[PDB]
Design an enzyme around this catalytic site. Structure first.
Site, PDB file in Angstrom:
ATOM      1  N   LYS A   8       0.839  -1.223   0.000  1.00 51.15           N
ATOM      2  CA  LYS A   8       0.000   0.000   0.000  1.00 51.15           C
ATOM      3  C   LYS A   8       0.859   1.251   0.000  1.00 51.15           C
ATOM      4  O   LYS A   8       0.923   1.985   0.969  1.00 51.15           O
ATOM      5  CB  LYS A   8      -0.921   0.017   1.222  1.00 51.15           C
ATOM      6  CG  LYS A   8      -1.866  -1.194   1.294  1.00 51.15           C
ATOM      7  CD  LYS A   8      -2.861  -1.044   2.464  1.00 51.15           C
ATOM      8  CE  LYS A   8      -4.099  -1.901   2.241  1.00 51.15           C
ATOM      9  NZ  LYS A   8      -5.029  -1.707   3.372  1.00 51.15           N
TER      10      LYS A   8
HETATM   11  C1  LIG Z   1      -5.629  15.269  -1.953  1.00 48.65           C
HETATM   12  C2  LIG Z   1      -5.367  13.862  -1.436  1.00 48.65           C
HETATM   13  C3  LIG Z   1      -3.928  13.345  -1.404  1.00 48.65           C
HETATM   14  C4  LIG Z   1      -6.448  13.088  -1.007  1.00 48.65           C
HETATM   15  C5  LIG Z   1      -6.434  11.816  -0.468  1.00 48.65           C
HETATM   16  C6  LIG Z   1      -7.335  10.907  -1.235  1.00 48.65           C
HETATM   17  C7  LIG Z   1      -7.530   9.576  -0.553  1.00 48.65           C
HETATM   18  C8  LIG Z   1      -8.083   9.489   0.882  1.00 48.65           C
HETATM   19  C9  LIG Z   1      -7.215   8.446  -1.282  1.00 48.65           C
HETATM   20  C10 LIG Z   1      -7.330   7.126  -0.849  1.00 48.65           C
HETATM   21  C11 LIG Z   1      -6.604   6.125  -1.776  1.00 48.65           C
HETATM   22  C12 LIG Z   1      -7.053   4.686  -1.537  1.00 48.65           C
HETATM   23  C13 LIG Z   1      -7.750   3.885  -2.637  1.00 48.65           C
HETATM   24  C14 LIG Z   1      -6.865   4.083  -0.311  1.00 48.65           C
HETATM   25  C15 LIG Z   1      -7.254   2.772  -0.039  1.00 48.65           C
HETATM   26  O1  LIG Z   1      -6.717   2.407   1.196  1.00 48.65           O
HETATM   27  P1  LIG Z   1      -7.219   1.110   1.966  1.00 48.65           P
HETATM   28  O2  LIG Z   1      -7.433   0.007   1.019  1.00 48.65           O
HETATM   29  O3  LIG Z   1      -6.279   0.881   3.096  1.00 48.65           O
HETATM   30  O4  LIG Z   1      -8.542   1.617   2.674  1.00 48.65           O
HETATM   31  P2  LIG Z   1     -10.131   1.434   2.312  1.00 48.65           P
HETATM   32  O5  LIG Z   1     -10.392  -0.153   2.515  1.00 48.65           O
HETATM   33  O6  LIG Z   1     -10.932   2.370   3.228  1.00 48.65           O
HETATM   34  O7  LIG Z   1     -10.373   1.706   0.720  1.00 48.65           O
END
Ligand SMILES: CC(C)=CCC/C(C)=C/CC/C(C)=C/COP(=O)(O)OP(=O)(O)O
Ligand SMILES: CCN(CC)C(=O)Oc1ccc(C[C@@H]2CN(Cc3cncn3C)c3ccc(C#N)cc3CN2S(=O)(=O)c2ccc(OC)cc2)cc1
Ligand SMILES: [Zn+2]
Lengths: 315, 403
Positions: free
Chosen positions: A110
């Site tokens: 990640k």
């Molecule tokens: C301007 C800027 C840099 C904004 C940030 C945008 C942002 C929060 C992007 C997230 C990217 C992403 C797909 C994470 C998945 O993490 P994960 O798989 O650990 O978490 P999840 O299961 O909640 O998708």
């Protein structure tokens, strides 16, 4: 060569091969903010990385140092950029570097930098032949890794490797039919190959989903897929859909079924349907069933949907 | 009565797995079990629930982090301006003033981070990148003095943004980096606040963003990718800054976010069939204010005049009961460790859920003790609306570089 977790690891400041170079300590000012209290090992690697960066030392020793710097903070995009300059200047063998990034992604899947580096290697080599299998290993460990899916899409698009992907999808959907990334990959494969504007495919897709919905009615993914592939033609264009959903209520009811009903009615009303002021009340009955009883976390959305429908399809 | 999450009928909102167990359902049931324990603890301990935001604990955690961080933050050594922004924003939300000399020390530090070729890097001598550029510019605006504004080299900044602009409308995150809807938001945020938007800077950009909306209603990081709250925020917010919000199917987008609030937990997930978090209190719920201002601009007369289109109360209950560390700081979910990122975005989300605004109409919902009420935050930039107005005003004094 000398691993960062080797019992015999030595600080760069105590290495003879590094005596000619003066480390560059971090210039943080007379009164620093958000000053991180680095371990000795981190500070030592980075003091030497700054030295080679500022001198633009394009050397084998600099190359090995980027390795340790990366291991200590793989999010450091400045080190990755310098490592790429070194790969090119030193004429490093890029398959060996492919072996390296594989091992790194495997440890820190990640992280943006790590996947971007892999992509740069694949484009330098013009060689996608390890990718689907490598990506499938990462997805075997985390089947929802966003970078892994993004890199897969990129490789499939760029090198036209569409032919076995729907089969991979099928496999993973069987493993976990709730995997929204795999439903998304399904849409990605179909819409870039056969497309959905075709009756034979559009059907098989629908029958497959209804079949999934039946096995596990409270899986929202299949419901969003179903909605997703029918809805931009318009749900009212398919008049059997109503009936077939209005038949599994007492058997397979959910807020998803009821909400799909409202979407059907909504499109019916948006086109000048039969029994207008009639199908409208069916919808409102359902909205308030959702806002008051069945889906109250969305009360504010469903009351807003009760309203907008009232506003444009009543008197 | 009176906490939504403790009502008897709330137990009916637990996961129905249809006797079909997969990885996804097993993981959701684990979370729901932990959260139910939190909700239940009052009853089991025979105490009246009282929801309190532990302001003073949060303040001391922040006050300290602004100066010094443990080696646990080694992973954020290429992101120090992020830390300045998270912490300063958190203090601003908690209504804690910034000593003129922490202000000046932040300014000086961010100047050391600024690149001679424009933009800011993750620390002194690091190459520039749009993420730390965004964070630096937001931090400077929160500080809001003439000193802080003067740190930014607007001319170089504009050069930097052009260096990242692609033919298809997109931007790279950094030179030699790759493209992402995040980069368009970082670019539009920094450009709009500092008044450096040219007629062609963002040509193609709304269309590129619009290509990222998918069959789900939300926005993925690039065309074809799964819808995610982080990317949906960046995409919508960038389109609001560019006035191109119309390019999206706002209706499928609305149905998608609203669907991301968890019926049991009360917080938001990032994508469908994943887990509640923490920071999505801002990234997901902050979409609602933006959708309100958009749909209102199209004359939607079905819009509430008092509430955003999510369960404000349930989100506040999630954050207050499940996302506070007793020692100070906030977190993703119970059993995770505190950090300055979740402190920023959990508090930003709390604030959103508390304050409804829609031109003339103003309406607050403050769960727990009235002391819990935070300062408001601007849904586009996630700094105080006063800092935004103020900043946009001072840089309108200058011409768009080139002119
Ligand atoms: C301007 C800027 C840099 C904004 C940030 C945008 C942002 C929060 C992007 C997230 C990217 C992403 C797909 C994470 C998945 O993490 P994960 O798989 O650990 O978490 P999840 O299961 O909640 O998708
Ligand atoms: C550029 C917009 N800003 C303002 C500076 C911003 O903060 O945007 C983001 C920057 C990076 C990210 C990705 C991650 C997210 N995480 C991991 C996480 C969050 N919620 C659940 N998880 C698993 C975190 C977590 C903690 C902290 C802190 N302090 C910061 C992030 C930011 N980043 S990260 O890639 O740098 C990161 C950092 C530490 C970490 O170990 C827990 C994992 C990822 C998301 C938004
Ligand atoms: Zn989080």
């Amino acid at each position: 060569f000398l691993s960062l977790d080797s019992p015999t690891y030595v600080l760069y400041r105590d290495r003879a091969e590094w005596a000619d170079i003066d480390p560059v300590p971090q210039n943080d000012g007379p009164s620093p903010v958000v000053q991180i209290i680095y371990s000795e090992k981190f500070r030592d690697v980075y003091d030497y990385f700054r030295a080679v960066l500022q001198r633009d030392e394009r050397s084998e020793r600099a190359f090995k140092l980027t390795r340790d710097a990366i291991e200590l903070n793989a999010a450091n995009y400045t080190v990755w950029h310098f490592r790429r300059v070194l790969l090119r200047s030193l004429q490093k063998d890029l398959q060996e570097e492919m072996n390296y990034i594989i091992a790194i992604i495997e440890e820190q899947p990640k992280n943006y930098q790590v996947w971007h580096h892999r992509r740069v290697l694949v484009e330098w080599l013009k060689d996608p032949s390890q990718e689907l299998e490598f990506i499938a290993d990462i997805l075997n460990q985390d089947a929802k890794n966003y970078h892994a899916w993004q890199h897969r899409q990129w490789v499939i698009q760029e090198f036209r490797l569409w032919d076995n992907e729907l089969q991979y999808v099928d496999q993973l959907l069987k493993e976990d039919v709730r995997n929204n990334s795999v439903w998304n990959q399904r849409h990605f494969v179909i819409s870039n190959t056969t497309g959905y504007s075709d009756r034979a495919v559009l059907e098989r897709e629908v029958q497959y989903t209804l079949e999934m919905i039946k096995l596990v009615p409270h899986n929202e993914s299949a419901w969003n897929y179903l909605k997703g592939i029918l809805q931009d033609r318009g749900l009212s264009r398919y008049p059997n859909l109503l009936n077939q959903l209005l038949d599994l209520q007492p058997s397979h009811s959910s807020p998803y079924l009821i909400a799909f009903l409202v979407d059907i009615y909504e499109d019916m009303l948006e086109n000048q349907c039969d029994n207008k002021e009639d199908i409208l009340n069916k919808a409102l009955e359902l909205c308030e069933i959702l806002a008051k009883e069945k889906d109250t976390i969305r009360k504010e959305y469903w009351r807003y949907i009760g309203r907008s429908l009232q506003s444009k399809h009543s008197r | 009565e009176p906490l939504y999450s403790l009502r008897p009928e709330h137990a009916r909102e637990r996961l129905q797995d249809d006797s079909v167990e997969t990885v996804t359902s097993i993981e959701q049931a684990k979370v729901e079990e932990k959260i139910q324990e939190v909700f239940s603890s009052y009853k089991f301990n025979h105490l009246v629930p009282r929801l309190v935001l532990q302001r003073e604990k949060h303040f001391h955690y922040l006050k300290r982090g602004l100066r010094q961080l443990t080696d646990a933050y080694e992973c954020l050594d290429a992101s120090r301006p992020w830390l300045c922004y998270w912490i300063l924003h958190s203090l601003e939300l908690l209504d804690e003033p910034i000593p003129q000399i922490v202000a000046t020390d932040v300014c000086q530090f961010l100047e050391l981070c600024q690149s001679p070729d424009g933009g800011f890097g993750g620390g002194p001598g690091q190459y520039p990148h749009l993420a730390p550029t965004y964070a630096a510019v937001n931090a400077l605006c929160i500080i809001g003095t003439e000193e802080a504004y003067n740190v930014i080299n607007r001319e170089k900044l504009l050069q930097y943004l052009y260096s990242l602009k692609q033919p298809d409308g997109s931007f790279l995150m950094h030179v030699g980096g790759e493209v992402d809807v995040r980069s368009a938001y970082c670019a539009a945020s920094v450009a709009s606040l500092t008044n450096i938007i040219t007629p062609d800077l963002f040509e193609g950009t709304a269309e590129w963003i619009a290509r990222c909306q998918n069959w789900e209603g939300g926005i993925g990081g690039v065309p074809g990718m799964e819808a995610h709250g982080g990317y949906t925020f960046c995409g919508l917010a960038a389109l609001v800054i560019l006035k191109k919000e119309r390019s999206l199917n706002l209706k499928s987008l609305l149905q998608w976010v609203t669907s991301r609030q968890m019926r049991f937990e009360g917080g938001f997930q990032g994508r469908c069939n994943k887990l509640v978090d923490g920071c999505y209190s801002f990234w997901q719920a902050g979409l609602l204010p933006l959708l309100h201002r958009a749909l209102h601009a199209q004359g939607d007369p079905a819009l509430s005049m008092s509430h955003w289109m999510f369960h404000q109360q349930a989100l506040q209950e999630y954050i207050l009961m499940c996302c506070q560390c007793p020692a100070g700081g906030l977190l993703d979910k119970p059993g995770k460790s505190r950090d300055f990122y979740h402190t920023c975005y959990c508090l930003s989300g709390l604030s959103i859920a508390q304050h409804f605004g829609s031109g003339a109409m103003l309406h607050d919902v403050v769960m727990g003790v009235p002391e819990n009420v935070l300062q408001p935050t601007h849904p586009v930039y996630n700094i105080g609306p006063d800092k935004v107005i103020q900043a946009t005003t001072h840089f309108l004094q200058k011409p768009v570089p080139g002119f």
